[PDB]
Design a protein around this ligand. Structure first.
Ligand code: ADP
Ligand code: ADP
Ligand code: ADP
Ligand code: ADP
Ligand code: ADP
Ligand code: ADP
Ligand code: ADP
Ligand code: ADP
Lengths: 215, 215, 133, 133, 133, 133, 215, 215
């Protein structure tokens, strides 16, 4: 179902994670050491030059719905490989881009999705920096969002009804995670202890307000 | 308030994003071209060798609450920088790790947070791969999660009350985004049209079940 | 009618010859000396970075039916330029290829004609060697 | 009858084309991969450093009426090879020139024909652009 | 009982002297010549990259109570080796420091003793100059 | 009474320690920063190129009974300096050796004592490892 | 009148010596330090790339009757320089050759004189080796030579008439240098003291004979 | 009788020339190709590292009265070799110097003669440049010299008595070389034809005078 062509810092993580999730993954790499190291973290692991068409054919690359092109430094190899894959009519080709130019040429040679890892981690890290309590989040729209917050010493031993967010800030609490244990859509009697995960939902500015005065 | 020491693919994104959010950021780089290119995307931009203590002092680095060490290839430079910063009693030092070894030595020299960008993008990309319908998601815990899904033709013109997720699958719908318009905590009469954003919340396997039989 | 983007050993020859035949040619080059040397061998000669879209727009590159991409060594610059030209709906884009890979990426990004100079002169020279008469 | 010393974009084409025409061609190259790839496109293919006289002798280079010096980037190697060949009394020595200077030194050391591939393809491409019909 | 990882001016001396005293010493080195030269001055001598964990395991490095990290110039290799050894729960890890920074990072990753050779020989030489008698 | 020509890891230690013991020491260094840093750790500190005879004369190097040549990496500078000092009839010349070869040439050019810092600290460290008590 | 293009071990010596003799010399070098060091040993000294024609023109290189190309390692630079100089119609171009190939190409591009320094010093050193008594010499032809000899204890207090070289060995004595004082075409009564300079002239083998039995 | 340790541009010439003169020479070289190439130009040729004492012993280096150290670039190897040779009490050790420092250390480690090839060829070339007619010469003293001159079109078909040098310039002609044929101490009736070798003897300034007005 999944084939990962470059087993580096980026692609290797994709391989290991997909394997950990329970999907079947074929790992490819030109470097034998890399192939050996990922033998345990993949259904199958093969030594192959992804820029060589007959080798791609030998891999049975056609058996796959998703092929990930994760060769970092060598732009030539990456775009050539992506090209060969597009020739073989692979349904989904995901390639890691190094820069603007690489993104452009991948764009035109029919890459289905282009990933800028360090860029995205850039914005994500910026998000966590801007607010140290936000552990994670998802934006529903330009104005509305669901936010994951780390409870500070302002929130310990407080009940949901005490923190009347539904009226005071127009936001609603969705979940509380205490010592790994999880409470979904909790009732107003429930207690939030410090260092716990708190999942709020509402307007961005309203959530910021609640963070400011509340915690 | 924020200082970014390495203006590369990773650090540059952090800088640009922090600047876009409205925070004041001091960008550092040994490469003059990089400093010039990030002049517009930062409050201040300086040419400096982050491995030279007197230069760090010249930057007024102690005036900052958060310093980001984002020098990629040069592990020596990274750990040296982190060390010097730790000597200067910087409250929060975030460093990009290249490998396991780098993570360990940064860990021991008192790095406050160590980031593996390509790894994390690895797992999230794996997440988007496992379901093309999940546009985004957030893990509340090992078993429970909030998921954003792309509506298929199986869900078109279906009501929330028609798709009884709260009893049949034990999960709860949180939001519906239809042509950009947004419905928060929608009522059972509401309609879901295909290709719209659907926000479900619950157990991972249960949501997977709902994906399987429902859509 | 004709624009030549790279004034090197290859492109410069195209420019000079087209000019000698009596056609009007706009010569482009990032190197000022090259532009100066071909001032006499072209209707107009301009300093410009062919990988910069706004510069291409400033050249009035769309007013041309034929644009020749003759940047040799820099594969990246060549393909990026070809790309920008393809975006600007240029009717005929002819590019000099460095190798097989360059030929492939140029092929896919919609190059109208891809030339392998050394190859073609190769077969031509072989022809001349086969019968000197 | 024919020997091609540099199996690159230029020389490789000469080799392949001469072989395709039905002439017997000896392909030389310092790079083993190139030699391997042109085994099928030549009567014989040999790994050799064309700047080493004893290797040239080992090739039986004197048995040839036409020897082609097609080493691109390395001007030094090119002129050294041409020189050694001129010493071995080769009847016809054709060399690919990189620039004006290379053309001059090849000219003086007795090169029988000096080819500027990109230039000639330049004028021919200009010809084709001038009248597409 | 003793393992010396870097057989240079510093570590080689440790090895030779420990061997001369009658203790059993395992000498390690990435350079084959060094390993060969110290075969006679050690119980066992092995070619190995001290920055590679599986090689460390292959050496049976855990069987040793004292491991000496004596890699000079390469600070990275030194700290990486020290780190790997600290992971393998080596009881006593003594490392040669190049500078203040190296001393600090070795200090934090749990080096049992950090030696500054030139400094100590400095103070001792000063002692000898102060009273030659 | 004492002159230290190289203020590095080795020589700087000698200087600082001799100064701490109460002897008068003249510190030399080609690097101004080094001279500045050791201003407090020496009776006098001077910027000078030890391979330049007139500079040595300007230092009043002959007024000293002991001159320490502690220039590490630069073997040439070290031996040249030692040589100039031997010409100037310096009573005691002590030089830091880099390797066997350096030891040999220093040996022949009349060095009074040749020190191998890393070697000696090597045996010393081996001693400390043999009996931790 | 004289221009030296390469100020290295070879060319620098030519420059310095020509300057010491009293001729006016323009020294050229691409290396600024070299140009600075030869400022005192030349009429003029200039930083210039000898492979750049416009720079050569800027030097006023055509105003010179003799131009010396003494660039060692870089054969390409040497031949290119020689070529450019030949284009500028320089009357006399002397170039240092690195090897046989270099000698040949310089020969063909119209070098007026090609020098192999280490070769020539090779043969002369061989000459001084064959007889430690020959301090210097000059070959008139393949068979005949003029030789300068160091007097041994076999020749001490001997007269020219005592050592009848003109008949017994067919050679003729030309000069005697005794404690620096010099005697040209000395009379038969003159005495030769040991360790003095003796200038004989004749056939090589005959002089060797005289060395053998005489001294 | 002679051993040459470095078979390069310099040492190889010494070897070949000594061999051509008829002396027996042992050539040493660490490079096998060099040893093979000089097999024909030496009595014996051996592959050896001159910095290795036991190899020197294996060569039978002790059998030689003269050992030439002609290793160019590697100063360390040169001085180390010279040192080893001095330890083995070789009577005559001649070494090629690269620079001032090398000359100094060779001087102190007991080198019997130190040669600066390119320097000496420098002064020699300067001599031939200063006067194009002087082919060679030997200085008897600061003021007096014997000079070899190339006859110009001023001297063709002239008799020695016509060019009364013995009175007019105080100099005396010693030899005339015509088409390889040689005339020693020629009588006044003899003719000098152009392009012939002419050997004059006398005062330097006087010889210059004769060159000026005569030829
Ligand atoms: N032609 C190729 N075929 C297959 N695998 C390749 C090829 N070129 C590179 N790779 C693999 O891709 C990986 C690149 O990893 P890396 O350079 O760390 O990129 P990233 O930083 O994106 O992880 C390497 O592990 C290498 O083995
Ligand atoms: N010692 C240093 N001090 C300051 N900046 C540095 C230093 N070393 C490297 N840099 C900067 O850090 C940047 C590294 O970026 P890059 O190598 O792309 O890392 P990444 O791939 O993680 O973005 C370079 O642009 C360089 O200018
Ligand atoms: N990005 C660019 N935009 C515009 N001109 C460029 C760009 N990159 C290179 N050039 C020009 O193209 C020319 C390339 O010529 P060259 O490298 O000699 O190729 P060739 O050998 O095929 O002629 C150079 O003279 C350079 O000035
Ligand atoms: N010294 C040499 N002897 C023999 N062959 C050589 C030598 N140097 C280079 N070559 C060969 O000549 C070829 C030159 O090809 P290339 O650099 O592509 O020139 P071009 O661009 O003109 O084709 C290479 O394949 C190389 O193997
Ligand atoms: N990664 C490594 N693994 C094992 N041994 C190493 C490694 N790197 C260097 N060494 C060895 O360590 C020794 C270091 O010696 P040297 O550089 O002279 O240090 P010092 O000057 O302290 O003696 C070398 O002999 C080298 O072979
Ligand atoms: N020619 C010279 N004259 C005077 N001082 C010199 C000369 N060459 C080097 N030095 C000084 O000697 C010091 C050498 O120290 P270093 O290279 O660290 O050797 P070590 O590692 O043995 O201390 C340098 O600080 C330099 O300033
Ligand atoms: N292209 C050039 N133009 C001018 N000077 C040059 C050029 N290339 C080299 N040189 C000079 O010529 C000198 C070469 O000297 P060197 O390598 O010692 O030759 P040699 O050993 O024959 O003296 C260098 O000092 C360098 O500065
Ligand atoms: N350790 C050594 N033992 C023997 N021969 C050596 C050694 N090192 C170098 N050589 C020889 O000395 C020669 C040096 O020649 P080269 O570098 O041209 O110097 P030069 O310019 O004085 O001729 C080389 O041919 C090499 O084979």
């Amino acid at each position: 179902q999944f084939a990962v062509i470059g087993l580096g810092r980026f692609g290797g993580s994709i391989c290991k994670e997909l394997h950990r999730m329970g999907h079947e993954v074929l790992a490819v790499d030109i470097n034998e050491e890399k192939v050996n190291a990922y033998a345990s973290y993949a259904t199958h692991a093969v030594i192959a030059n992804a820029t060589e068409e007959n080798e791609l054919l030998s891999l049975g690359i056609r058996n796959f719905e998703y092929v990930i092109v994760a060769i970092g430094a060598n732009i030539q190899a990456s775009t050539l490989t992506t090209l060969l894959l597009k020739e073989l009519d692979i349904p989904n080709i995901w390639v890691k881009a190094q820069n603007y130019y690489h993104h452009k040429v991948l764009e035109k040679i029919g890459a289905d999705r282009i990933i800028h890892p360090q860029k995205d981690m850039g914005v994500k890290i910026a998000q966590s920096l801007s607010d140290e309590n936000v552990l994670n989040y998802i934006d529903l729209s330009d104005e509305y969002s669901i936010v994951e917050l780390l409870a500070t010493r302002k929130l310990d031993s407080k009940s949901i009804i005490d923190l009347n967010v539904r009226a005071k800030y127009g936001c609603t609490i969705l979940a509380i995670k205490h010592h790994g244990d999880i409470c979904l859509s909790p009732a107003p009697e429930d207690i939030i202890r410090e260092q716990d995960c708190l999942v709020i939902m509402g307007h961005k500015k309203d959530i910021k307000r609640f963070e400011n005065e509340g915690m």
